[PDB]
Amino acid sequence: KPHRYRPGTVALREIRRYQKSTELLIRKLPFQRLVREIAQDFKTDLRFQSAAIAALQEAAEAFLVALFEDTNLCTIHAKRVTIFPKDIQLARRIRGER
């Protein structure tokens, strides 16, 4: 079993969250710009804690990925196919949220 480094100045849970941040797949600038695009339709005086944008991105990426997980799990073929919208939709009706 490998040896684990445990910093004295910083807890590992913090480290884990920062790491995950580096694992996000959508460029952060276009993401915050998408949040801005949405927000200006609500109120022009709205502000966001930076950490709120972080929470939004992490949750959003998990939401999209799980859509594809469900689609994947519902797709059973001897030879690979290309995933289309109807596959997403069908999977969602089968194992997804209603």
Binding site: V35, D45, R47, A55, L56, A66, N72
Partner: protein, 83 residues
């Protein structure tokens, strides 16, 4: 007859990688714009709740806590968080 849509936003490679992270190795043309659409809707849903909380507290700033309360109401994604 094929046409390339112009996009300022989430690029094809990120969407291909998100799909791949889901185990999906190949996706249609409509998938990219669907992923942008779906993303936008999810975010709208969350932010609509978050701002309902922000205004209930009489603040002009949406905080991380507002976003948590909103996310918990979006179904399975954050299910179980905090207990």
């Amino acid at each position: 007859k094929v046409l390339r849509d112009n996009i300022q936003g989430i690029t094809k490679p990120a969407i291909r990688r998100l799909a791949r992270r889901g185990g999906v190795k190949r996706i249609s043309g409509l998938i990219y714009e669907e992923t942008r659409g779906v993303l936008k809707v999810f975010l709208e849903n969350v932010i609509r709740d978050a701002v309902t909380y922000t205004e209930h507290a009489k603040r002009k700033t949406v905080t991380a806590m507002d976003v948590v309360y909103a996310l918990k109401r979006q179904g399975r994604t954050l299910y179980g968080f905090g207990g």
